[PDB]
Amino acid sequence: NEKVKKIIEFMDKNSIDAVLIAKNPNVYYISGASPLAGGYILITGESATLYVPELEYEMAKEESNIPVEKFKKMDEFYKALEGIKSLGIESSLPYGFIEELKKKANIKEFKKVDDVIRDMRIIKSEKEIKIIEKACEIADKAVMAAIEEITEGKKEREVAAKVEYLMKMNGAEKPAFDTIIASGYRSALPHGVASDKRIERGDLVVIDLGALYQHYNSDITRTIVVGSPNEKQKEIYEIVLEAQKKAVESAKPGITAKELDSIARNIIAEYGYGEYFNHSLGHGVGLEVHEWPRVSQYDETVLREGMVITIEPGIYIPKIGGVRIEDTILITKNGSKRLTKTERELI
Amino acid sequence: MDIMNEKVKKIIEFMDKNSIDAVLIAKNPNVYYISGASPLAGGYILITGESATLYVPELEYEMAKEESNIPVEKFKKMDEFYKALEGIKSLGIESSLPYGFIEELKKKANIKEFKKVDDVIRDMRIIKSEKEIKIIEKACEIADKAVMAAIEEITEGKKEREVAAKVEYLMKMNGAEKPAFDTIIASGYRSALPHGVASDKRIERGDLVVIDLGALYQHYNSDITRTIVVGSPNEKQKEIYEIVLEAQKKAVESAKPGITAKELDSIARNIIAEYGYGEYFNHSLGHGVGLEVHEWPRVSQYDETVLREGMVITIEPGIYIPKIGGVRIEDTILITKNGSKRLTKTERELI
Ligand SMILES: C[As](C)(=O)[O-]
Ligand SMILES: C[As](C)(=O)[O-]
Ligand SMILES: [Mg+2]
Ligand SMILES: [Zn+2]
Ligand SMILES: [Zn+2]
Ligand SMILES: [Zn+2]
Ligand SMILES: [Zn+2]
């Protein structure tokens, strides 16, 4: 396939004899198969083969677009690698595995192939975009359900369980990540995963969730308030809303991820809340919840049509609470498109 | 010097005996096991001969400081972390540490040599304390409740994924953080797929249905598999079922200290092979369970680990007939002084 072809081209330019792909999302991206257990793709100058343990063979044989080989013990796999001098690998390959490759496969050199994997996955195909949009649609439904479920006295975890159930009933494999239902002081926390805390009147409630649908992810955050907001809560909400909207409106091909982050960050900084916006503006979304590019002050990746990223500025104040508004957006030919469509002005 | 816990000291012992200058622990389950902290972002424990420190990003400091039993240090940029590592000659690392990170350590921390510390981590985690066993047993209680709920929910017409959604909700409402792994509800031809995660397929009468699920509860895992038939089973379904049941029961009864994992795997495998279904029992008999659903030891033909009191493993033989159906019966068990204890207690003879 075209993906294997691009890897072979990269191998030729970088004097790599063979490439090993082992990370789940990359194995699926290339072969179309997703063995839960350990699956490995070996790409040579003229072939691509997926190796899987026997228990995953039947599933892999019916889902893979490249030849499949099964093995009983890892020794058979290494035997298939003996002879390779320079091996291209993912930066995620674990130490234990690399040491086994040196000892049992006699690999002489390792080179990172992350660049070619990134260059491919960072631009979504029309088909991938449609799956991501469906995942976002499911996430939108989950956020609305969360709002309905929220009431004084209910545990954050109960709301989370209820909406995760709804997402799965809508076709999701599972949540894209641990659901965040953070109320009151918890809304100002770094990663407020739903807890046993009970929601209280006057609480700001951050709802950050996503659905994993047919291998692709979605990501959305909306913040609401139980009852009426006080002056401070309303103020930080208005600023985050302004920053989020301006950043989304500014997203387009040609500008750097850093430039985009600066748009939202400068708005928040000018209002005097710069020290309370403690994370990046966003991240890419695809086969993984967090992927390329990183939308921050440290990544100047030039945006291009086909990229899918989140725009999620926020302001977090100890005890008082926090506000975050996040959308998963698609970079189009001339601008952007919000894939998550839930109303943002909720406070 | 620091007053360090016994887990840290066991690592220090290993360090001295293996000429290692310092040890870096970065995998979540290990960081929790050693410090009690659960940094969602990147937490790193650095152990030296006289100190143990947990380094975490700013967005993790406050919580880590509250849950960690060892001194916590925060950093704004990784360069700050690598600076702390400067001077280390031989660094002990986990077999899970990624290539990219190791290359960074080589250049920014100028680490000269790396050595595996997997053996000491394994030696500690492979034997569960009475405290850990109680947590795992409760997770198994939650898993048992989920399996019983699944059986009651499974009927002709039901979508596999919907059954999964219902029992995963039940587990959470019963205290579980979340499922230990993607719930498997494999019906009909799908029961022939060992890892047939619940799908959009609708269950039909006469279907063999494999239910494999588990709960992550207070950091520990549970794992259970029961197979049922919707309606009356035919003779061929009953045949493979009786064989798997016989093999599973015999293996559980044979589990005791002194036997190797390979010898235990052979008990179940030889039974299934004698019936001529050896080619269809395409996976190991089991795996250890603890902070991770899959851990030491591997109960297979390729593991010589001698079982000891305190080990927690699964016993899950199965037979899978391609495109037709399959059967798997799995229990999480505890190795006792001279036998075993079934932590998962749901009835096994369900057809
Ligand atoms: C909490 As998130 C998946 O938006 O980084
Ligand atoms: C599907 As399992 C966690 O029993 O290997
Ligand atoms: Mg200190
Ligand atoms: Zn999010
Ligand atoms: Zn996000
Ligand atoms: Zn299982
Ligand atoms: Zn298992």
UniProtKB/Swiss-Prot annotation, chain B:
Domain of life according to the entry: Archaea
Subcellular location: Cytoplasm
Cofactor note: Binds 2 cobalt ions per subunit.
Needed cofactors: Co(2+)
GO biological process: proteolysis
Binding site for Co(2+) 1: 223, 287, 316, 330
Sequence positions that bind Co(2+) 2: 212, 223, 330
Coiled-coil blocks: none
Keywords, sorted A to Z: Cobalt, Cytoplasm, Dipeptidase, Hydrolase, Metal-binding, Metalloprotease, Protease
GO function terms (MF aspect): metal ion binding; metallopeptidase activity; proline dipeptidase activity
InterPro entries: Creatin/AminoP/Spt16_N, Creatinase/aminopeptidase-like, Creatinase_N, Pept_M24, Pept_M24_MAP, Peptidase_M24B, Peptidase_M24B_aminopep-P_CS, Prolidase_arc
EC assignment: 3.4.13.9
GO cellular component, one term: cytoplasm
Top EC category: hydrolase
Catalytic activity: Xaa-L-Pro dipeptide + H2O = an L-alpha-amino acid + L-proline
Oligomer status and interactors: Homodimer.
Function: Splits dipeptides with a prolyl in the C-terminal position and a nonpolar amino acid at the N-terminal position.
Protein family membership: Belongs to the peptidase M24B family. Archaeal-type prolidase subfamily.
NCBIfam families: dipep_PepQ_Arch (NF040821)
Protein name: Xaa-Pro dipeptidase
Organism: Pyrococcus horikoshii (strain ATCC 700860 / DSM 12428 / JCM 9974 / NBRC 100139 / OT-3)
